[PDB]
Structure prediction request, 124 residues.
Amino acid sequence: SLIQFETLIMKVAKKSGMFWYSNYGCYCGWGGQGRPQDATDRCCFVHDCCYGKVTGCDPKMDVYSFSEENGDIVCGGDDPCKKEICECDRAAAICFRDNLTLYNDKKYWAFGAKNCPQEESEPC
Ligand SMILES: *CC(=O)c1ccc(Br)cc1
Ligand SMILES: [Ca+2]
Prediction:
């Protein structure tokens, strides 16, 4: 669920999703169009595409299971579809953590729709 995605961002990237990734660039926020503007924005774009490929369950609402083990987040449970959602959230949390060197809200927060042209939308 989205609450769990916020939780994974806090655990992995040591940052809040709502404070740092909810309106950054073209894609770190709900939906999106245009080009991923930088490495953090591309992490959100891939997360959108991953969610778009989940068939059978709901990435917003459904609750997945995970454990911390061997220094990593391990997605689990008995449901393949819910584990797919967890994998999308875990990959994006690690992607955020790994691209903190580049993060730049001064340049990219509330980047604006003109800057994210419908015609430049990179396909998944
Ligand atoms: C999938 C993803 O990264 C993302 C980020 C922020 C919001 Br709000 C929704 C989705
Ligand atoms: Ca988005």
In short: The pocket of p-Bromophenacyl bromide (ligand 1) is lined by residues 21-22, 28-30, 44, 47-48, 51, 92 (CB under 6 Å). The chain is about 45% helix and 10% strand.
